[PDB]
């Protein structure tokens, strides 16, 4: 089988800045599984970032952790089987190693285990600057 | 939560030469779990290397994907906490991102699947030239 997932983007910012973030999906998996991302901070396990509904076309669902409500954004664009992960005015403390994340049980855009991911794309190191 | 895997080594190799992987786990994940490896060739999803379970006692049982029988050793140690695979007669077949795994449902090393994975560590690429 065929990696499903492929991350795009990445480096180091200064705090206030922002950074725009890419995976794209097979057909298959963007149509059918929620699509989300996690961040895997030093030291510490990854958590939650944000989650999109399955196959987000015209219209979607999007939810959040409360860390980053209202600064981070995700989206997509069916044409490119693409995610984005918008992040906004950056603290040092979003430093870490991002990872999207598919679910083929889910359908609604919500908290996301990650023991129930199905497929991961290659952590990319966003780093923040003080 | 603090980070529950944490691995070491990696590198270039020569075709036919031997390379060792290790990762640690928190006290409570590896008592908890059934340890294995994954790997990643360029472009594909991960695939099962092997496992490896606690029995009563110093005892373990370890399982080998097919790819893998005979090549590599996979082991464990309580007072460290850490899982081993050690990989002898390496091929450019072999070249792939290592992953380590947690399984806290498995209780005997069999085949794992990945979507049934708790947590990972972070990738670590292998390379073999020919």
């Known amino acids: 089988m065929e990696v499903q997932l492929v991350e795009s983007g990445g480096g180091l910012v200064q705090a206030g800045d922002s950074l725009r973030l890419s995976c794209?999906?097979?057909?298959?998996?963007?149509?059918?599984?929620?699509?989300?991302?996690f961040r895997q901070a030093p030291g510490k396990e990854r958590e939650f970032?944000?989650?999109?509904?399955?196959?987000?076309?015209?219209?979607?669902?999007?939810?959040?952790?409360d860390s980053v409500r209202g600064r981070f954004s995700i989206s997509a664009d069916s044409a490119k089987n693409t995610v984005y992960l918008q992040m906004n005015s950056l603290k040092p403390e979003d430093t870490a190693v991002?990872?999207?994340?598919?679910?083929?049980?889910?359908?609604?855009?919500?908290?996301?285990?990650?023991?129930?991911?199905?497929?991961?794309?290659?952590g990319t190191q966003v780093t923040v600057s003080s | 939560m603090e980070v529950q895997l944490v691995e070491s080594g990696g590198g270039l190799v020569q075709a036919g030469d031997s390379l060792r992987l290790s990762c640690t786990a928190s006290?409570?994940?590896?008592?908890?779990?059934?340890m294995g490896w994954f790997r990643q060739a360029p472009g594909k999803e991960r695939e099962f290397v092997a496992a490896?379970?606690?029995?009563?006692?110093?005892?373990?049982?370890?399982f080998y994907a097919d790819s893998v029988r005979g090549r590599f050793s996979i082991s464990a140690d309580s007072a460290k906490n850490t899982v081993y695979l050690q990989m002898n007669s390496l091929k450019p077949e072999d070249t792939a991102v290592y992953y380590c795994?947690?399984?806290?449902?498995?209780?005997?090393?069999?085949?794992?699947?990945?979507?049934?994975?708790?947590?990972w560590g972070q990738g670590t690429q292998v390379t073999v030239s020919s």
């Open positions: 490896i379970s606690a029995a009563p006692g110093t005892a373990y049982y370890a």
């Open positions: 795994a947690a399984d806290l449902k498995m209780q005997v090393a069999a085949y794992m699947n990945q979507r049934s994975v708790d947590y």
């Open positions: 006290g409570r994940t590896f008592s908890r779990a059934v």
